[PDB]
């Protein structure tokens, strides 16, 4: 039950079931990014997350997602379809366990994807934005002892350059992670603008900190699924977030495959 | 024990005990606002909150307040005398249950009142200020699943206009909700000024988010009970907060009755 | 088990074991400040914190620190060697219990020391900085009822003047307390700069609020152990923090002894 022990055990199961000793990249799919899977490549192995140690919070029954093993270029990639966010009420160890288990299975790069509100003038709905840095505004950490991790270049600049070779149209921005699940007030958005954020969302920051803690590099990719509250007046809804996710799914899947191949 | 089930059950008790099928407005009284009750109108039914499902946190014995049924104009109003704030240590479901139960009893408008420190130059002690928007600075939410609520116009502009017809002297401002129960340092107040806040307090933000989630409109009213730490130098105390509440009680009760009548 | 009852009981043990009815000053040593003890003075009594009521969180076995009784000038000083921070996962009552117990043993002044990242241009590694005020950015409080404490001059200006008589080179600054244990991103540091912070760390804010709540004056002293993330590019590590602590230990111990003597 130490998160690191269940991570090791998950990796044993992954290697055993896939035949693959080392998956060197992993992908965590954001809200609304699920339809991008087909466009990533064809999975050779599909593992229910429930059949893997440490993925499911002990209580609250509910059909977790899948973990896919997908060849992308010269990489074997672990793709996380379905995830748990802090707003679900479970210990952060479940929010970040996929990262830790992927790391234990050999992932040296974590591609952490999300749905985000755009805060910056230039941003359009459907636009992918690389994460240059983050503001963790949750007052929490997935780390528990005296485990001090340096977050300078938490979002690898070189993976960034790598990504922009694949799509020179890729802007980058600072992502603010909030608890959710309520969206923000217009006043809260003006505040985030003041604090230096370009993107806003309810995930990612803990996955990033756990990745860094475990020694992996991180590429962060936001899909702008809406403009942030108050910027245009358009109402925010999860259905609208899923809808933007699904409209951009072939683009996102294709982008991720090209970038990952380039690693 | 689902908060929505205890809300429904509370509403059954309310309708049964008051004879009133639908209370279409509710009022949550702020710290120090208790003496305003007399001035709201005469209650036809008084219900100990302890006799209502879901109001009292299982543990920590202590004499909760009352829920009053009060005719105000063409409305039957549920008035909450006594409440629980997050600084008490209980699950947020108890902080917001009065809102949810009022909603289940038919309230389509929640008048959420509070005591606040004034951050903006123009503000005087004893002055009521409408809440135009809020900064939730608690890192928490009363919502728990994937329950995504849009907080654009969380504080109904039209209820605002409505209120100002009753008292054209009503300024409005952005309210920052903090955890408490310690008051703020002068440095924290300068920070809140930078973040765009006009008012500061230890309640309200969760009641507002739960209201919106449940489909009610919100009118937020702050009594400025003191200037925020560092602005004038005057020391902050709860006795001083209660004292300002009590000095302004007839004014506040009268204001609320007039505004509510106008709904 | 009320924190105040275990505080009283700890003070009974302290007075019994030291022979000293009243220790009028206490010192809480920061990360990396442990080697400063020798330079404070020679302890007359050394008490394992485990032998004192309320210091150790019920679970998670681990060798706590010591509480030392040290004559410094005309004062008997309680010196805390080893402490618990919020990032350890324990209830805040354990983070602040040393303050409360010291107060119950007669401490009217708490010298709260820490390791901090420097955010302001002028700051050098190894430099002690007095805390003029704080930003509590944890979304938490060590206070639990309706216990409202005014934090105006939480860091006694007069103790400040007192300290600067001992070392006229002492700059002062606003300290931001964050949860940790991950260090900050460069974007988070630019945000803290915007919010008015000069120093950043993972302790102190709760000890200060508990001190004030209990009626003690506070002197806050940060050792700048590194420049904050992104300011110079230098990587942050706990080993580097301990190393700066140890290099500055004789200076810090000597400074504290001189200042405390002057009280
Ligand atoms: O605007 C947003 N805010 C918070 N989370 C989100 N997830 C998608 N869009 C948003
Ligand atoms: O100044 C304040 N700060 C926080 N809460 C308050 N409640 C009344 N006044 C205040
Ligand atoms: O830079 C810092 N940030 C947070 N905590 C710290 N403790 C020492 N230095 C630091």
Contacts of residue C256, Cβ cutoff 8 Å, sequence gap at least 6: C27, C36, C40, C111, C113, C221
C10 annotated to a ligand binding site = no
Write the DSSP symbol of residue B1: -
- Binding residues of B, as ranges, are 31, 63, 83-85, 115, 184, 203, 226
| Atom 6 in ligand 3: residue holding the nearest Cα | C201
Q: Are B100 and B210 in contact (CB under 8 A)?
A: yes
Ligand 1: nearest atom to the Cα of A117: 1
Tell me the backbone φ, ψ of residue B46, rounded to 5 degrees.
Answer: -120, 120
Q: How far apart are CA C76 and CA A188, in angstroms?
A: 49
Q: Are B117 and B199 in contact (CB under 8 A)?
A: yes
Tell me the backbone φ, ψ of residue A223, rounded to 5 degrees.
Answer: -90, 120
Look up A202 and say whether it is catalytic.
yes
CA B159, B163, B165, B166 dihedral sign is positive
Chain B positions touching A191 (Cβ under 8 A) are 135, 195-196
Q: Is the CB of B33 under 6 A from ligand 2?
A: no
How far is the CA of C114 from the CAs of A143, B86, B92, B194, in angstroms? Answer: 21, 29, 33, 27
Interval between CA A50 and ligand 1 midpoint (Å): 27
A20 is written with which tokens?
């693959």
DSSP per-residue codes, A62-93: ----EEEEEEETTEEEEEEES---GGG-S-HH
| Atom 2 in ligand 3: residue holding the nearest Cα | C117
A76 is written with which tokens?
């074997």
Best CA proximity match to C193, nearest among C219, C231, C155, C139: C231
Q: Is the CB of B228 under 6 A from ligand 2?
A: yes
Q: How far apart are CA C131 and CA C222, in angstroms?
A: 7
A185 is written with which tokens?
């007030």
Q: How far apart are CA A86 and CA A182, in angstroms?
A: 12
> Nearest chain B Cα to C198, which residue?
B187
Burial class (CB in 10 A: 0-12, 13-18, 19+), C206: buried
Residues of B taking part in catalysis? 31, 63, 85, 87-88, 115, 202-203, 226, 238
Interval between CA C109 and ligand 2 midpoint (Å): 26
Look up C114 and say whether it is catalytic.
no
| Atom 5 in ligand 2: residue holding the nearest Cα | B201
Q: Is the CB of C176 under 6 A from ligand 3?
A: no
Count of CA atoms in the C-beta half-sphere (13 A) of B56? 16
Q: Are C28 and C36 in contact (CB under 8 A)?
A: no
**Structural domains present in chain C:** 1-263 (3.40.50.1580)
Chain A residues whose C-beta is within 8 A of a chain C C-beta are: 132-136, 139-141, 143-152, 154, 174, 194-196, 209, 212-213
Best CA proximity match to A128, nearest among A164, A80, A155, A159: A164
How far is the CA of C198 from the CAs of A123, A139, C189, in angstroms? Answer: 33, 20, 10
Q: What is the CA radius of gyration of chain A?
A: 17
Ligand 2: nearest atom to the Cα of B228: 1
Contacts of residue C148, Cβ cutoff 8 Å, sequence gap at least 6: B180, B181, B182, B183, B236, B237, B238, B241
Q: Are B195 and B85 in contact (CB under 8 A)?
A: no
How far is the CA of C49 from the CAs of C36, C76, C224, in angstroms? Answer: 18, 18, 27
Q: How far apart are CA C74 and CA C59, in angstroms?
A: 39
Chain B positions touching A190 (Cβ under 8 A) are 196
Answer yes or no: do A139 and B134 touch at CB < 8 A: no
Interval between CA B67 and ligand 2 midpoint (Å): 25
Q: Which ligand is nearest to the CA of C150?
A: 2
Best CA proximity match to A143, nearest among C179, C188, C187, C138: C179
Token pair 């007399």 is at which residue? Answer: B38
Number of Cβ within a 10 Å radius of residue B122: 10
Q: Rounded to 5, what percent of chain A is helix, strand, coil?
A: 35, 25, 40
Among A183, A186, A194, the residue with its CB nearest the CB of B195 is: A194
Answer yes or no: do A87 and B140 touch at CB < 8 A: no
Contacts of residue B253, Cβ cutoff 8 Å, sequence gap at least 6: B35, B36, B37, B38, B39, B40
Interval between CA B117 and ligand 2 midpoint (Å): 5
Q: How far apart are CA C168 and CA A7, in angstroms?
A: 53
Token pair 């020798």 is at which residue? Answer: C38
Q: Which ligand is nearest to the CA of A189?
A: 1
Q: Is the CB of A175 under 6 A from ligand 1?
A: no
- Binding residues of B for phosphate, as ranges, are 31, 63, 83-85, 115, 203
Q: Is the CB of B200 under 6 A from ligand 2?
A: yes
C197 annotated to a ligand binding site = no
**What is the resolution of the experimental data for this entry, in Å?**
2.0
Tell me the backbone φ, ψ of residue B145, rounded to 5 degrees.
Answer: -80, -150
Answer yes or no: do B181 and C145 touch at CB < 8 A: yes
A136 annotated to a ligand binding site = no
> Nearest chain A Cα to B195, which residue?
A191
Interval between CA B190 and ligand 2 midpoint (Å): 14
- Name the structure determination technique: X-ray
Give how far B233 is from chain C: nearest CA, Å: 8
Look up A191 and say whether it is catalytic.
no
To test the contact with chain B by mutation, choose from C119, C150, C156 the residue with the greatest count of B C-beta atoms within 10 A, namely C150
Q: Is the CB of A25 under 6 A from ligand 1?
A: no
Interval between CA C149 and ligand 2 midpoint (Å): 10
A130 is written with which tokens?
């690389």
Among B179, B186, B191, the residue with its CB nearest the CB of C195 is: B191
């Amino acid at each position: 039950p130490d998160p690191d022990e269940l991570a090791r055990r998950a990796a044993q199961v992954i290697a055993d079931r896939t035949g693959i000793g080392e998956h060197d990249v992993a992908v965590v799919l954001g809200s609304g990014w699920l339809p991008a899977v087909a466009a990533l490549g064809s999975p050779t192995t599909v593992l229910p997350q429930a059949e893997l140690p440490g993925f499911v919070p002990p209580t609250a029954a509910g059909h977790a997602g899948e973990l896919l093993s997908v060849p992308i270029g010269a990489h074997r990639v672990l793709v996380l379809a379905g995830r748990i966010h802090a707003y679900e009420g479970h210990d952060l160890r479940y929010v970040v366990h996929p990262v830790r288990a992927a790391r234990a299975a050999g992932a040296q790069i974590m591609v952490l994807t999300n749905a985000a509100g755009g805060l910056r003038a230039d941003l359009q709905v459907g636009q992918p934005v690389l994460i240059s840095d983050h503001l963790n505004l949750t007052a929490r950490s997935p780390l528990v002892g005296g485990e001090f991790v340096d977050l300078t270049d938490a979002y690898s600049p070189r993976l960034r350059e790598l990504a922009r070779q694949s799509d020179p149209q890729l802007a980058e921005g600072v992502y603010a992670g909030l608890p959710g699940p309520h969206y923000e007030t217009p006043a809260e958005i003006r505040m985030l603008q003041t604090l230096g954020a370009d993107l806003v969302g309810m995930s990612t920051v803990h996955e990033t900190i756990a990745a860094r803690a475990a020694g992996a590099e991180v590429l962060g990719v936001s899909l702008v699924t809406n403009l942030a509250a108050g910027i245009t007046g358009e109402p925010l809804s999860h259905a609208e977030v899923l809808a933007a996710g699904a409209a951009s799914a072939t683009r996102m899947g294709a982008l991720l495959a090209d970038v990952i191949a380039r690693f």
